Design a protein around this ligand. Sequence first.
Ligand SMILES: [Mg+2]
Ligand SMILES: [Mg+2]
Ligand SMILES: [Mg+2]
Ligand SMILES: [Mg+2]
Ligand SMILES: [Mg+2]
Lengths: 184, 49, 73, 196, 71, 140, 266, 159, 153, 241, 174
Amino acid sequence: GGYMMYHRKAMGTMKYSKWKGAHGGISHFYGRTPMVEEVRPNEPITLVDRRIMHYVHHSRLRHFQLFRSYQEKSNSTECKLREGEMLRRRWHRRLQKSFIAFMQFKTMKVLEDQARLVNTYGQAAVNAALGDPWNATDNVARERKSAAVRRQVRALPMVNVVPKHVATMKQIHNDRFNYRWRVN
Amino acid sequence: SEMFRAYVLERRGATDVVTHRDAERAAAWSQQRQREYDAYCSLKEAPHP
Amino acid sequence: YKMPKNMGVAPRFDTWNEKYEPWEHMKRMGRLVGTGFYIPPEWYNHFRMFPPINHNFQQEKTLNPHNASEPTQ
Amino acid sequence: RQHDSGVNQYGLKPTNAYDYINPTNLINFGRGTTFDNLGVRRAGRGEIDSSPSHSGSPVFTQAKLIGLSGEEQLTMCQSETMALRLCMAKAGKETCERESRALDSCLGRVGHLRRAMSEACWEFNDWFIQNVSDNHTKPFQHRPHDWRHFYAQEKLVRERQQNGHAYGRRPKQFSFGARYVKTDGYGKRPRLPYNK
Amino acid sequence: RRREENLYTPIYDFCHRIREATEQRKRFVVVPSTIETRGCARVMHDHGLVAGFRDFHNDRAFAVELKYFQG
Amino acid sequence: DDMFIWLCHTAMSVLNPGDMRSRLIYNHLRILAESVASGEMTQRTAFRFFESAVRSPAYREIAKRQLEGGAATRLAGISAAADVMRRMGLTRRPMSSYFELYQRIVERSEAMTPWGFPPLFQFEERLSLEPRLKFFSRAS
Amino acid sequence: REGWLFGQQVQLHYHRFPDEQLITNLSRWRTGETVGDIAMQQFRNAQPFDIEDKDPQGVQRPSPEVYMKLNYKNPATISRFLTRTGHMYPADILPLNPEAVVKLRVAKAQAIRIGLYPRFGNPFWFRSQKFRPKAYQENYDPTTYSTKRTVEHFAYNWVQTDRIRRYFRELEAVHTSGSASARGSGGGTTAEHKQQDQFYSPENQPISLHRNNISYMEDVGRSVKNPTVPGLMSTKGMKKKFHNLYSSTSTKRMGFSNPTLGIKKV
Amino acid sequence: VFYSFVLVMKPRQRRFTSQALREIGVAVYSNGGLIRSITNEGIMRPYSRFRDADNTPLTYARYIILQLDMGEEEMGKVDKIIREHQDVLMALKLNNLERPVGIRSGNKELQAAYFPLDTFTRLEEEINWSPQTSADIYTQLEMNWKEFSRTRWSSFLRN
Amino acid sequence: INYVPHAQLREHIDKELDKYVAGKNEPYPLNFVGQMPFLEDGDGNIVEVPESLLSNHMAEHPDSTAKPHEPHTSSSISEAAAFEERMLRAMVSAKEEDLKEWLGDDSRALSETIDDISREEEEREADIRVARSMEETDAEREVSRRAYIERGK
Amino acid sequence: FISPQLPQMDWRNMSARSSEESIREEMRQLAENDVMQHQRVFNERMWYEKEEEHRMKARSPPRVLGGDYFKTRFGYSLVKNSEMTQGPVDYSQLDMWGEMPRYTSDMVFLYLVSRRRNTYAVAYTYEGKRILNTYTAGNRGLKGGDRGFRSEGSTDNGHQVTSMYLNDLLPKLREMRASEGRPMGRGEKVELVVRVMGFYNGRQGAVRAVQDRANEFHVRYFEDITPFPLNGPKMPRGVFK
Amino acid sequence: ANHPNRQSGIQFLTHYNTHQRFRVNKDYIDYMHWGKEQGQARLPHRHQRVAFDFNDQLHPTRIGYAWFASQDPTFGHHPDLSSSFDPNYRVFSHPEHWNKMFTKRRPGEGDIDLSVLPSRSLLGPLMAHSDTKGIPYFKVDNRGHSNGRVPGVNAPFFGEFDQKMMQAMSRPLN
Ligand SMILES: [Mg+2]
Ligand SMILES: [Mg+2]
Ligand SMILES: [Mg+2]
Ligand SMILES: [Mg+2]
Ligand SMILES: [Mg+2]
């Protein structure tokens, strides 16, 4: 029978089944395409893919799509799950702020420590310890140091991990990325 | 309303650019008003018997 | 039915202050000493003539954060 | 005197009438319990019932905060390891141990960095216990039923719009294409419940 | 709002205003102004149950100042 | 010994406790101290006594003529608080009073939000902190 | 009693009173250590950042001009408020003034049915990045819910301290040992120190204190990756067993065993 | 405006486009209404392919903007006239033009309480801004403000 | 406001329909969506296409002949201020060439690394404990079921 | 360095410092340094930025308008605060199709669809004609009567399938091109558009088996078409709801 | 009261038409986003309170300094005179104004009335901008302050400020 595109049985391969829509070039997906990336010359498409997937996963879009596209759930269970999600979020936010309000104190104590180092060894000395080019006679030394800093600052492409999808038996959640039990 | 429909497409150097067709005219206008302001103020400083 | 662990020993968050407030001890000790049968402790011998401030009220009884309750703090 | 006012000789000192009928509550709060450990309901650390609480739900994610041992965990050196990996993959005729030296330098520092972060985090656990945690004494805020009153306020509103009638009522879900499959004279979109 | 409910009086909620404002330890209460209400206020202020009161000739309400002693 | 803790609170835990050299406020503090020792009063009760004690008419509005944010200087407080423990017979060896009152403050100086305290854990109450985490305690 | 922000029982601060730095450091102060002291100056009155959302739900976002273009005919300005898929952000992620939300969902609707915006996807996604506050990991915004960034800067500054310490331990080391190139027999170190300390020890110059050292280094070239041929035993065809593998004894004292661990589909 | 339309049309030979627009226009005049502006745009490439009366999906379409003053009774007739025409792929209708979203919310209007005549006088272009609009019009606007306010009475009190 | 009367209708329609006629000496006005649309000659066949769309137009109907349509140019100041505009655009393309991605040097050397670390993550994953329910068959499920039902004996 | 320096012989230099010129100078100096510093200890990053800007800059009366004038200009107050660039604005920041794919009559569209228990790949001519059939994780063996369903839709299966498909895809492509007279004899790549569906494990591996073919296939555009359900017909009912 | 929708309690000290806060059909409160400055989300907002604390300030008298000329020349703005103070001011409450009940609570959804928050759009000031100066210049309004001549607001102020209400409630001895 007619299935939607995100349906389980959507694109079937069988003797009866035949795919629907213009399937190439200007296609069925014409204005329905969620992402587009022009591949930068000499860039493997694996970085492209892992960037896309990290994006979708971190913003909880792949969560949503997996969730809704597998089973039906009544508007009550959907509400319960979404608002539960959002309230757990709220709680953990109010935890993060506490942690952060402490870590800014820790960072302060560190900077203070740095001040005490300053008036033990004198300011200029401390600056020397931190990579100040006081030994730079001419610009060529400067350009060596700054060439070093350039070769550091240039960012090698980050390969960001995407948690695998866990296929369980009757699939209570197809959002399952871990083996922990969940409240449905 | 006939202001907002007055934009236009020109090619500057090698690149495409959207400009107002009337922009320079408004610049002349605003400049003239500024010069009249200057006249007015300089004239308030003029000798007052 | 799951509940936060220590709810058994949970303090009364409105009234747990009352017990400790200076006026209460002033009154109680006041009618204890009045009996004639109790030797007054010395703090009473002192604050007898310098009773504590009037209008300092907790935030528990008055639910106003903006009320500046204490002349001191 | 020699110890706490909330704890007498035989256990927690039983103030409310619940303690006198149920005096198991005085001497046993769990399997992390000791006798000095009464009245301090949280037990030691790394110990059973040592976890601090935040608005009643316990804090079991601490390491995940400072980014030690988490999936989202903070990584110190990336550029190095990538650089070195590139070196290994390119060719075998030239071998660069220069990269492996920059990297092992990086690591050598990383160790002390991590011990520092851990120490600072334990100080955070201490501070959080002193000045924030309620010691599991307040009602959970983190699940929707705890907020029922809030939702009630919304249901009430949708009722007063309906002439103060249908509480908790919602529009009948129609069909995937109810609007275009129905003939003239039948409702093609879901109405307010009172409107039925 | 309905039949079975009591029929309230300016005196009824005058008393309950004052009671609740006394429980929350407030200095001032805005309270309904009718003949017997501000009568009640003058009598209470006679006996010294109330620090003070005033009618501003505001139609709806007038104000009472509460007195606390020993906390 | 809990006495030193109490005195630490009166010294460091109170914004603007008037001029603590003046014989009036000084006597307040003296009496309350002798009442925390010899168990005649709870620490909480004696603290709330101290901060609610009678000082001077229009106190805040005289405080606007000295303080900006209402935080006075802490020297008078510590000098008075040591003085009281010396004049009362609190310790067998005279120095110990001053030393402990000083030391306990210096250790707390390094702590995050050092001079504020949660009102429940600040003093004696049903539920307490473990002896390591108690505030001006010797075990921190 | 709860603070509003995270529910703290105190009001956050670092220092309060004018005297505390003095009184804490008093012996140093009479001594005169504290004269040029920049630690007692810089951080003396230093207080915490304000970590607060001035807009918990932004009535500020967007600034006024933007509203003009929130209509159906500005695909770009629609796009700066969506995800890269075109969906809206949940309220507690990207908060918007309710006007903006109305105008935006209406816009995307209209634009879609007129064919001026795609049914999925954000066509302006890259162009719009200027308008979004992209936050560099190098700057620090005192207000973030990011717990990573905070600890990153903590790391950074602490390591900046460690650098100093290490610099000045290797310096004084270099001068204690370089004194020997300055004075061979010069003395300047005690005779008893000549007896006891001139011998190799774990503090002086140990050989190596740890297992798995590096011995036998050579210049030989790298080999081909995966020189090894797969073993005859197939690891692929074997199924991994965890829970039932060994036999266990339950420490359960009383009551029914928890239904969530076992007896409950994941 | 009182009403506006965006009409996505099939890109035909010019005589046909002109006939169709004459049909819509005459359909507006017969029904006792006015045309503030009939604006033409080019043949564009939309984000969604439209099918025409031939059920042949189209990659390109001609866009046409209508701005009308009608009664709300007889624009039902014009509506089902326009939507039922074979050369119109799609038509979206804006009725919000007299009270648009950005006004009359908690006394935002200074010196007046909902003056309706502010947005009626205006055309759609200045109520809803097009993307090309930049800070440059902030200039032009005021030269068209000040200038206007100078010549208005003198022009009006002439006759 | 210029209201189109019934008399002026077809004249005004034609004035607006000839707006883009595919040649002029003057710069063209944009859309309400702010695009430069296709230039049709008389009778509305599409003669000239703007450079953003040329690829797809040509790919869909190759037989169709159309020209890339360039705006009429206008120069501010001299060719000097224009060369300075050129320096500005090349400098912005330089800061963006810096910021965009470094990508090492050679492609295959990078791809090898990415795939390696994906593999290592795959086999550090395979060592995680699963849940009891995932691991066991229906056999022992039924075993524990009967074992539970009969428990009262 | 133990070269005796007498404090009396310096006197001339000290007298130079009593002159109000040099003290005017120390005043200017100290008043320029008295603005509040946000620098604190020496920073490598900021030094680098500073000197990089120095390399970039080394490579490098009219009546004041009063408050009344800006009182009368309503526009100006809105220009000062505006986000909108004033001047000629770049067109590439307007046009809809600026950031979007640009296709060619010769392109091959590779579909990698990852499903939960399955993965498959297909390829299509730009004109929509199917090249080779759909090679599927159950079509290639690789699935049933085996290890389990848990691993059925896994990464390595997707890899097996895609890498098996491309191998068979090249020759048929050269034949379909030989039919119209496009030889593509040597030193050519197929320009490929990889369209990926599904957010399932079998996706990762799939694209990897494309990347190792980079000497044969050249990927211009990577765009994923993944259906999103706003709402629609009911999905099959699961266990709980 | 443990019943949901009855949580707002019994407050008499409100200005509403019921002493039972939870039967009041006017202002539905918001438990999640409310009560930063007022303590609990049940209690009345700072500007609507009909009962006042000892050490807390009471309401500002609205103006809508010139009239202090007789006073201390340095005396700045009196703390209780405010330009904008509205006793009738609608505070945004989600369950009323943004109501997600009839939806699945997805990101854009819920019905919104915009009549609450003042419009931050630029549409308003553009659409109404006129060469004729505003209401104040035109002096369209009759009346003025509703109490007529007021020493603080309209007329000048002489003598001394009573900041506590001490002279304002006293009993005539005569
Ligand atoms: Mg059938
Ligand atoms: Mg149960
Ligand atoms: Mg229990
Ligand atoms: Mg337990
Ligand atoms: Mg059932």
